[PDB]
Structures are given as structure tokens and as C-alpha cells.
């Protein structure tokens, strides 16, 4: 109710193309439909330890210090952005969003209280028990800026103030490093050189700058672009890809089994699969030329690699382009499609990719990121401006 940016905003960002063999109404309809399916399967509000609290059902993870993980802050972030964007279509959007925010603040980090602990577990003891994960807080904080522009901050929750506190007292204080990179979480060092590229949400950082006036975010953006290029020119000169995790300076791929996540932490794997969308959005929304450069390189490589067939994309690649994965999943495919929207000569590829993703349902991770990608490439992810 009282949406100032009701769905569908269907914006047309300069220099970018959208799938064009279907109408905008068809694009919007595909998104509405995907959302209803996503919401029904993943949006939850059954926490005995937190009535009125919402979260996004993640995959059956391992033992989280004895607790049973139901979701993560990263899922919380995806859900919160999705929810605010669908406001206008989903009449219960603000109620759901405030419920997601309730969970995010109740399950605050055990280190920096202005951030969210990365695990959602149905227990009072788990509330304020876990430390943070940088990407979760980045999406959550960003969602608060969207909420502010969507409903204003005069109601029950002061979206803008909450955003500013989270951005400055949380993310900047604990995650922005001394050499202006982004560390892995509030448990990580202020001088840490360990970083996760999928955390380089350039377009999010632009908004942070615009809503706080803190130039710190601009210097972080510029440094990260420098780091990306320095990294790629040496380790991915023919693909433009980046690894799940990056370490040291000059930046280099993290070793295998980094943080015990997987043996491919040194390559373009599940964490990195999200990077193409995070980067391209900066060019689309703010016209950053460095974003278009990085996007076109990756886009052209993947197109040639699959001979223009998105169904040939696999879930994982070595930095030199050699296959690691074996099948097409949305978290990998969709971002590759989004990274292709800055060049009009990729229209057919964008059309084929859209057809592949629009109704692709599989699991929490791919589905959630696919919806975010779909929202963006259809012009329904508008940008918050003061």
C-alpha cells in the first residue's frame, strides 16, 4: 500500500538491451509468475522463537554449532530485495518485508550488532549467536534503501535511518578494509586481504554513497575495479572470469578448499557465478564504463565457448575457461545472460537466455538468484536515488 515505485517499473536503462522477442507485458508476467512460485516455496514465517519473523528457506546445510540452519543472511538479503521490488503486485509486500527485517535485526551478529549473523535457526539461543557474512549485509542494507524509496521512512520502521546505521556502523566499520577492499565478514580482519568477488556489488555501493555522502564507498568501488583488472589480466586474460575467493596483493586466486567450502575456491565456481550480474548492474544503472568492459569480455567468452547455446553452460569453470561443471543451473546461466545486455549485437543470445531462464525452477540458490537476475534484465529492478 502506498507504493511510490510499484511493480512493474519496467525501466529502460541507457545502453542496455532487454529480451525483445516477447512484449514487456510478457516479461513482467514471467516475473510475476516466477515470484509467486518462489514465494510459495521459499518464503517462511514459522519460527517458534520469533513470531512475525520471516526468512528464506535455504538448503539442508551442515551442523551450525549444534543448531539446525533454516536459512542464511544471504538468503535473507535476496528475499528482502525481491520483496520490495514486487511491492505493488504483492499486496502484503511491506508486511513481509518488515517481517524479514525483524528477523535480520533479531538474529543480529555476535560481533558487530549492526549486522546480521549468517545463520537463521529457530532458537532464542541462536539469536545473536553467529557472526556475519559480508554479502548478506550488503543486500539487506541495500534493500532498506529500496524500502525507503518504496514506502518512505515515516512509518513503523525508519528504513532510511536503519539503512544508514547498517551501512556506516555495520558494513563500513567491520567490512571495509584499510586498503579499501571488502573482507569476508565481521569476524575477519580490518586489514584482511581475503575477499569474495561476488561481494563486489558495485551498484549497491553507488547507492550507499548517494544515501550517506560517504566518499569511502567511491574509493572502494574504484579500488575493487583496479583489483578485478589486475587479477584478470594475470589469471584470466582470455575469459575475464574471477575466482570464488581472492587473496593477497597483487590479488591472486585463493587456494583450493578455502574456508573448506569446496575444492574449486580457486576457480570460477558457485560463489563467483554471481559476479557477472553484480558488475554489469553498475554500467546499466550508473553508466560505469569499467563495468561494460568486464561484462563484454565475459559475455563474449561464454558465447563463443557454448557456440551461442545457453543450455551448454556448465556449473563451474577453471580461470582458463576449461569446464569443471556438468549441467546448466540458473545461478551460472542467468548472470552470464545479464552480463550480455550492454552490447546490441548480443540480442539473439539474450533472447535465447531469457527463454531458458524465465521458467527455470530447481532450488533455493539458483531460483533466488535467477529471480533477481530476471527482475533486473526486465527493467523491474529500479534504482534508489535520493
Short mmCIF file of C-alpha atoms in Angstrom, two decimals:
data_model
loop_
_atom_site.label_atom_id
_atom_site.label_comp_id
_atom_site.label_asym_id
_atom_site.label_seq_id
_atom_site.Cartn_x
_atom_site.Cartn_y
_atom_site.Cartn_z
CA UNK A 1 0.00 0.00 0.00
CA UNK A 2 1.17 3.50 -0.95
CA UNK A 3 3.94 2.27 -3.26
CA UNK A 4 5.90 5.06 -4.95
CA UNK A 5 7.70 2.57 -7.21
CA UNK A 6 5.04 -0.12 -7.73
CA UNK A 7 5.83 -3.19 -9.81
CA UNK A 8 6.38 -3.15 -12.72
CA UNK A 9 8.63 -0.11 -13.09
CA UNK A 10 9.89 -1.64 -16.35
CA UNK A 11 12.69 0.91 -16.73
CA UNK A 12 14.89 1.21 -19.80
CA UNK A 13 18.50 1.79 -18.78
CA UNK A 14 20.66 3.58 -21.33
CA UNK A 15 22.97 1.38 -23.39
CA UNK A 16 21.33 -1.91 -22.45
CA UNK A 17 19.02 -4.29 -24.29
CA UNK A 18 16.20 -6.48 -22.96
CA UNK A 19 14.87 -9.72 -24.43
CA UNK A 20 12.87 -8.46 -27.43
CA UNK A 21 11.02 -11.40 -28.99
CA UNK A 22 8.29 -11.11 -26.33
CA UNK A 23 6.47 -7.98 -25.17
CA UNK A 24 7.27 -6.03 -22.00
CA UNK A 25 3.93 -7.26 -20.64
CA UNK A 26 5.16 -10.81 -21.24
CA UNK A 27 8.43 -10.00 -19.47
CA UNK A 28 6.55 -8.62 -16.47
CA UNK A 29 4.16 -11.58 -16.48
CA UNK A 30 7.05 -14.05 -16.44
CA UNK A 31 8.49 -12.23 -13.42
CA UNK A 32 5.18 -12.06 -11.54
CA UNK A 33 4.69 -15.78 -12.12
CA UNK A 34 8.24 -16.70 -11.11
CA UNK A 35 7.79 -14.67 -7.92
CA UNK A 36 4.55 -16.42 -6.91
CA UNK A 37 6.30 -19.78 -7.34
CA UNK A 38 9.37 -18.58 -5.46
CA UNK A 39 7.36 -17.07 -2.59
CA UNK A 40 5.20 -20.17 -2.15
CA UNK A 41 8.22 -22.45 -1.91
CA UNK A 42 10.82 -20.32 -0.12
CA UNK A 43 9.21 -17.55 1.95
CA UNK A 44 8.70 -18.76 5.53
CA UNK A 45 7.32 -17.31 8.77
CA UNK A 46 7.18 -20.38 11.03
CA UNK A 47 9.84 -19.53 13.63
CA UNK A 48 8.56 -20.64 17.04
CA UNK A 49 11.31 -18.50 18.59
CA UNK A 50 10.31 -15.41 16.62
CA UNK A 51 6.62 -14.75 15.87
CA UNK A 52 6.14 -12.32 13.00
CA UNK A 53 9.60 -13.21 11.73
CA UNK A 54 10.20 -14.19 8.11
CA UNK A 55 13.15 -15.87 6.39
CA UNK A 56 14.05 -17.66 3.16
CA UNK A 57 14.27 -21.45 3.28
CA UNK A 58 17.78 -22.45 2.26
CA UNK A 59 19.30 -25.84 1.52
CA UNK A 60 19.87 -28.53 4.14
CA UNK A 61 23.27 -27.36 5.38
CA UNK A 62 25.55 -28.94 7.97
CA UNK A 63 25.74 -28.55 11.74
CA UNK A 64 25.85 -24.85 12.63
CA UNK A 65 27.36 -25.03 16.11
CA UNK A 66 24.66 -27.52 17.08
CA UNK A 67 21.80 -25.51 15.57
CA UNK A 68 19.77 -26.55 12.52
CA UNK A 69 20.13 -23.85 9.83
CA UNK A 70 16.84 -22.91 8.16
CA UNK A 71 18.22 -20.03 6.12
CA UNK A 72 21.15 -17.63 5.87
CA UNK A 73 21.65 -13.87 5.82
CA UNK A 74 22.47 -14.18 2.12
CA UNK A 75 19.03 -15.67 1.51
CA UNK A 76 17.57 -13.02 3.79
CA UNK A 77 19.11 -10.36 1.56
CA UNK A 78 17.81 -11.86 -1.69
CA UNK A 79 14.33 -12.17 -0.22
CA UNK A 80 14.28 -8.59 1.05
CA UNK A 81 15.28 -7.08 -2.30
CA UNK A 82 12.81 -9.30 -4.16
CA UNK A 83 10.02 -8.40 -1.72
CA UNK A 84 10.42 -4.63 -2.03
CA UNK A 85 10.63 -4.83 -5.83
CA UNK A 86 7.43 -6.87 -6.04
CA UNK A 87 5.58 -4.30 -3.91
CA UNK A 88 2.59 -3.07 -5.88
CA UNK A 89 1.86 -6.58 -7.11
CA UNK A 90 2.05 -8.41 -3.78
CA UNK A 91 -0.33 -6.51 -1.50
CA UNK A 92 1.42 -7.98 1.56
CA UNK A 93 4.88 -6.82 0.44
CA UNK A 94 5.51 -4.29 3.22
CA UNK A 95 4.25 -6.66 5.93
CA UNK A 96 6.53 -9.41 4.62
CA UNK A 97 9.47 -7.03 4.29
CA UNK A 98 9.08 -5.75 7.84
CA UNK A 99 8.91 -9.38 8.96
CA UNK A 100 12.14 -10.16 7.13
CA UNK A 101 13.71 -7.07 8.72
CA UNK A 102 12.54 -8.21 12.15
CA UNK A 103 14.45 -11.46 11.66
CA UNK A 104 17.53 -9.67 10.33
CA UNK A 105 17.75 -7.45 13.41
CA UNK A 106 16.75 -10.11 15.95
CA UNK A 107 19.36 -12.50 14.56
CA UNK A 108 21.99 -9.75 14.81
CA UNK A 109 25.68 -10.60 14.58
CA UNK A 110 27.60 -11.70 17.66
CA UNK A 111 30.47 -9.42 16.59
CA UNK A 112 29.01 -6.21 15.10
CA UNK A 113 25.38 -5.82 16.36
CA UNK A 114 24.53 -3.58 13.40
CA UNK A 115 24.88 -6.58 11.07
CA UNK A 116 23.11 -9.94 10.82
CA UNK A 117 24.50 -13.29 11.97
CA UNK A 118 24.78 -15.51 8.87
CA UNK A 119 22.60 -18.37 10.17
CA UNK A 120 18.87 -18.37 10.86
CA UNK A 121 17.99 -21.14 13.31
CA UNK A 122 14.72 -21.43 15.23
CA UNK A 123 16.07 -20.84 18.72
CA UNK A 124 16.37 -17.91 21.11
CA UNK A 125 19.95 -19.05 21.76
CA UNK A 126 20.78 -18.73 18.06
CA UNK A 127 19.58 -15.12 18.07
CA UNK A 128 22.77 -13.07 18.25
CA UNK A 129 24.95 -16.17 18.26
CA UNK A 130 26.57 -16.09 14.80
CA UNK A 131 28.98 -13.67 13.11
CA UNK A 132 28.30 -12.00 9.76
CA UNK A 133 28.86 -12.65 6.07
CA UNK A 134 29.52 -9.51 4.05
CA UNK A 135 27.25 -10.25 1.07
CA UNK A 136 24.21 -10.89 3.25
CA UNK A 137 24.51 -7.49 4.91
CA UNK A 138 25.18 -5.72 1.60
CA UNK A 139 21.88 -6.95 0.12
CA UNK A 140 19.96 -6.38 3.36
CA UNK A 141 21.29 -2.83 3.73
CA UNK A 142 20.63 -2.10 0.07
CA UNK A 143 17.09 -3.44 0.41
CA UNK A 144 16.48 -0.86 3.14
CA UNK A 145 17.28 1.91 0.65
CA UNK A 146 14.77 0.40 -1.78
CA UNK A 147 12.22 0.17 1.04
CA UNK A 148 12.78 3.86 1.81
CA UNK A 149 12.10 4.86 -1.80
CA UNK A 150 9.19 2.41 -1.99
CA UNK A 151 7.20 3.35 1.12
CA UNK A 152 9.08 6.22 2.72
CA UNK A 153 10.55 6.13 6.22
CA UNK A 154 7.70 7.78 8.16
CA UNK A 155 6.02 4.53 9.17
CA UNK A 156 6.72 1.82 11.75
CA UNK A 157 10.32 1.43 10.61
CA UNK A 158 12.61 4.26 9.57
CA UNK A 159 14.03 2.48 6.52
CA UNK A 160 16.47 5.26 5.65
CA UNK A 161 17.87 5.57 9.18
CA UNK A 162 18.15 1.80 9.54
CA UNK A 163 19.96 1.67 6.19
CA UNK A 164 22.38 4.42 7.17
CA UNK A 165 23.16 2.76 10.51
CA UNK A 166 23.74 -0.62 8.87
CA UNK A 167 25.86 0.82 6.05
CA UNK A 168 28.04 3.05 8.23
CA UNK A 169 28.02 1.48 11.70
CA UNK A 170 27.98 -2.01 10.25
CA UNK A 171 29.47 -2.65 6.82
CA UNK A 172 31.95 0.23 6.70
CA UNK A 173 33.06 -0.27 10.30
CA UNK A 174 33.56 -4.05 10.06
CA UNK A 175 33.88 -4.97 6.38
CA UNK A 176 35.58 -2.09 4.54
CA UNK A 177 39.31 -2.73 4.98
CA UNK A 178 42.21 -0.34 5.47
CA UNK A 179 43.27 -0.75 1.82
CA UNK A 180 39.65 -0.27 0.80
CA UNK A 181 38.62 -3.79 -0.21
CA UNK A 182 35.75 -5.78 1.32
CA UNK A 183 36.60 -8.56 3.74
CA UNK A 184 34.60 -11.76 4.28
CA UNK A 185 32.60 -10.79 7.37
CA UNK A 186 32.75 -9.01 10.72
CA UNK A 187 34.84 -11.86 12.11
CA UNK A 188 37.51 -11.02 9.52
CA UNK A 189 40.37 -8.55 9.99
CA UNK A 190 40.18 -4.83 9.21
CA UNK A 191 43.40 -5.29 7.21
CA UNK A 192 42.36 -8.62 5.67
CA UNK A 193 43.23 -9.15 2.02
CA UNK A 194 40.88 -12.13 1.77
CA UNK A 195 37.88 -11.18 -0.35
CA UNK A 196 34.92 -12.78 -2.17
CA UNK A 197 34.34 -11.05 -5.56
CA UNK A 198 30.62 -11.86 -5.52
CA UNK A 199 30.61 -9.32 -2.65
CA UNK A 200 31.73 -6.58 -5.06
CA UNK A 201 28.23 -5.21 -5.54
CA UNK A 202 29.34 -2.05 -7.34
CA UNK A 203 25.84 -0.71 -7.98
CA UNK A 204 24.93 -1.24 -4.31
CA UNK A 205 28.00 0.75 -3.26
CA UNK A 206 26.96 3.62 -5.55
CA UNK A 207 23.66 3.88 -3.71
CA UNK A 208 25.47 3.71 -0.36
CA UNK A 209 27.47 6.74 -1.43
CA UNK A 210 24.40 8.63 -2.61
CA UNK A 211 22.44 7.97 0.60
CA UNK A 212 25.24 8.63 3.11
CA UNK A 213 27.52 11.10 1.36
CA UNK A 214 30.47 8.98 2.49
CA UNK A 215 33.10 9.07 -0.28
CA UNK A 216 34.55 5.92 1.28
CA UNK A 217 32.22 3.89 -0.94
CA UNK A 218 33.53 5.54 -4.10
CA UNK A 219 37.15 4.77 -3.26
CA UNK A 220 36.16 1.18 -2.50
CA UNK A 221 34.44 0.93 -5.90
CA UNK A 222 37.48 2.29 -7.73
CA UNK A 223 39.87 0.04 -5.83
CA UNK A 224 37.78 -3.08 -6.48
CA UNK A 225 37.72 -2.33 -10.22
CA UNK A 226 41.52 -1.97 -10.08
CA UNK A 227 41.76 -5.27 -8.22
CA UNK A 228 39.49 -7.01 -10.73
CA UNK A 229 41.59 -5.89 -13.70
CA UNK A 230 44.92 -6.56 -12.01
CA UNK A 231 43.63 -10.04 -11.17
CA UNK A 232 42.15 -10.84 -14.58
CA UNK A 233 44.99 -9.57 -16.76
CA UNK A 234 47.19 -12.09 -14.99
CA UNK A 235 44.96 -15.05 -14.14
CA UNK A 236 42.06 -14.83 -16.61
CA UNK A 237 43.38 -12.93 -19.67
CA UNK A 238 41.23 -14.94 -22.09
CA UNK A 239 38.00 -15.31 -20.11
CA UNK A 240 37.73 -12.28 -17.86
CA UNK A 241 36.49 -14.50 -15.03
CA UNK A 242 37.44 -14.24 -11.36
CA UNK A 243 37.73 -16.88 -8.62
CA UNK A 244 35.29 -17.65 -5.79
CA UNK A 245 37.80 -16.15 -3.39
CA UNK A 246 40.75 -13.80 -3.92
CA UNK A 247 43.71 -13.27 -1.60
CA UNK A 248 46.86 -11.16 -1.13
CA UNK A 249 48.23 -8.28 -3.18
CA UNK A 250 48.76 -8.38 -6.07
CA UNK A 251 45.41 -10.23 -5.96
CA UNK A 252 45.56 -13.94 -6.80
CA UNK A 253 43.18 -16.89 -6.65
CA UNK A 254 42.64 -18.34 -3.19
CA UNK A 255 43.92 -21.87 -2.63
CA UNK A 256 41.63 -24.88 -3.09
CA UNK A 257 39.42 -25.78 -0.11
CA UNK A 258 39.46 -22.15 1.07
CA UNK A 259 37.39 -21.98 4.27
CA UNK A 260 36.62 -25.63 3.47
CA UNK A 261 33.86 -24.57 1.07
CA UNK A 262 34.94 -26.63 -1.93
CA UNK A 263 37.95 -27.78 -3.92
CA UNK A 264 37.23 -25.14 -6.55
CA UNK A 265 37.56 -21.99 -4.46
CA UNK A 266 40.47 -21.11 -6.76
CA UNK A 267 38.23 -21.07 -9.82
CA UNK A 268 35.00 -19.60 -11.19
CA UNK A 269 32.64 -21.67 -9.07
CA UNK A 270 29.40 -21.30 -7.13
CA UNK A 271 30.38 -18.13 -5.27
CA UNK A 272 31.77 -16.41 -8.38
CA UNK A 273 28.81 -17.42 -10.58
CA UNK A 274 27.01 -14.38 -9.15
CA UNK A 275 29.70 -11.88 -10.17
CA UNK A 276 28.60 -11.08 -13.75
CA UNK A 277 25.26 -9.70 -12.53
CA UNK A 278 26.80 -7.71 -9.67
CA UNK A 279 29.21 -5.99 -12.07
CA UNK A 280 27.00 -5.37 -15.11
CA UNK A 281 24.40 -3.63 -12.95
CA UNK A 282 26.90 -0.80 -12.38
CA UNK A 283 27.07 0.01 -16.10
CA UNK A 284 23.32 -0.33 -16.54
CA UNK A 285 22.34 1.83 -13.56
CA UNK A 286 25.27 4.27 -13.39
CA UNK A 287 26.95 4.05 -16.80
CA UNK A 288 30.32 2.90 -15.42
CA UNK A 289 32.43 2.07 -18.48
CA UNK A 290 34.71 -0.25 -16.49
CA UNK A 291 31.66 -2.45 -15.88
CA UNK A 292 30.85 -2.72 -19.58
CA UNK A 293 34.44 -3.74 -20.30
CA UNK A 294 34.43 -6.54 -17.73
CA UNK A 295 30.95 -7.66 -18.82
CA UNK A 296 31.65 -7.78 -22.57
CA UNK A 297 34.79 -9.83 -22.08
CA UNK A 298 32.99 -12.47 -20.03
CA UNK A 299 29.92 -12.34 -22.28
CA UNK A 300 31.88 -12.81 -25.49
CA UNK A 301 33.92 -15.63 -23.99
CA UNK A 302 30.93 -17.64 -22.76
CA UNK A 303 29.05 -17.09 -26.03
CA UNK A 304 31.96 -18.46 -28.06
CA UNK A 305 32.53 -21.24 -25.52
CA UNK A 306 28.97 -22.55 -25.96
CA UNK A 307 28.60 -21.53 -29.61
CA UNK A 308 25.63 -19.39 -28.64
CA UNK A 309 23.72 -22.10 -26.77
CA UNK A 310 22.99 -21.15 -23.12
CA UNK A 311 21.97 -24.73 -22.29
CA UNK A 312 25.63 -25.63 -22.87
CA UNK A 313 26.82 -23.51 -19.94
CA UNK A 314 28.09 -25.70 -17.08
CA UNK A 315 28.25 -25.11 -13.32
CA UNK A 316 31.91 -24.22 -12.92
CA UNK A 317 34.94 -23.20 -14.97
CA UNK A 318 38.70 -23.01 -14.48
CA UNK A 319 40.00 -19.47 -14.98
CA UNK A 320 41.41 -20.50 -18.37
CA UNK A 321 37.92 -21.49 -19.46
CA UNK A 322 38.11 -25.26 -19.00
CA UNK A 323 34.93 -26.98 -17.82
CA UNK A 324 34.50 -28.02 -14.19
CA UNK A 325 30.72 -28.29 -14.00
CA UNK A 326 28.43 -30.65 -15.90
CA UNK A 327 24.99 -29.05 -16.23
CA UNK A 328 23.15 -25.72 -16.67
CA UNK A 329 21.82 -24.12 -13.49
CA UNK A 330 20.38 -20.59 -13.20
CA UNK A 331 22.93 -19.13 -10.77
CA UNK A 332 25.53 -19.66 -13.51
CA UNK A 333 23.44 -19.20 -16.67
CA UNK A 334 21.36 -16.14 -15.81
CA UNK A 335 24.23 -13.87 -14.73
CA UNK A 336 26.04 -14.73 -17.99
CA UNK A 337 22.92 -13.55 -19.83
CA UNK A 338 22.70 -10.35 -17.79
CA UNK A 339 26.38 -9.62 -18.47
CA UNK A 340 25.49 -9.67 -22.17
CA UNK A 341 22.97 -6.81 -22.19
CA UNK A 342 25.44 -3.95 -22.80
CA UNK A 343 26.02 -4.84 -26.47
CA UNK A 344 23.18 -4.72 -29.01
CA UNK A 345 24.89 -7.44 -31.05
CA UNK A 346 24.06 -9.97 -28.30
CA UNK A 347 20.29 -9.69 -28.87
CA UNK A 348 19.83 -13.29 -30.04
CA UNK A 349 21.92 -14.63 -27.16
CA UNK A 350 19.88 -12.52 -24.72
CA UNK A 351 16.67 -13.87 -26.27
CA UNK A 352 17.82 -17.49 -26.01
CA UNK A 353 18.98 -16.95 -22.43
CA UNK A 354 15.69 -15.36 -21.43
CA UNK A 355 13.77 -18.32 -22.85
CA UNK A 356 15.99 -20.67 -20.88
CA UNK A 357 15.64 -18.89 -17.52
CA UNK A 358 12.12 -17.41 -17.42
CA UNK A 359 10.52 -20.62 -16.12
CA UNK A 360 13.60 -22.42 -14.78
CA UNK A 361 12.87 -23.77 -11.29
CA UNK A 362 15.27 -26.00 -9.36
CA UNK A 363 16.34 -24.99 -5.86
CA UNK A 364 16.83 -22.16 -3.38
CA UNK A 365 20.19 -20.85 -4.63
CA UNK A 366 19.59 -20.84 -8.38
CA UNK A 367 15.92 -19.86 -8.09
CA UNK A 368 16.56 -16.88 -5.83
CA UNK A 369 19.43 -15.51 -7.88
CA UNK A 370 17.52 -16.23 -11.09
CA UNK A 371 14.60 -14.12 -9.87
CA UNK A 372 16.95 -11.25 -9.01
CA UNK A 373 18.50 -11.51 -12.46
CA UNK A 374 15.10 -11.65 -14.17
CA UNK A 375 13.93 -8.63 -12.19
CA UNK A 376 16.98 -6.71 -13.38
CA UNK A 377 17.03 -7.66 -17.07
CA UNK A 378 13.33 -6.86 -17.49
CA UNK A 379 13.92 -3.38 -16.10
CA UNK A 380 11.92 -4.11 -12.97
CA UNK A 381 14.82 -3.52 -10.60
CA UNK A 382 14.77 0.29 -10.47
CA UNK A 383 17.48 2.26 -8.73
CA UNK A 384 17.03 4.09 -5.41
CA UNK A 385 18.00 7.75 -5.74
CA UNK A 386 17.84 10.41 -3.00
#
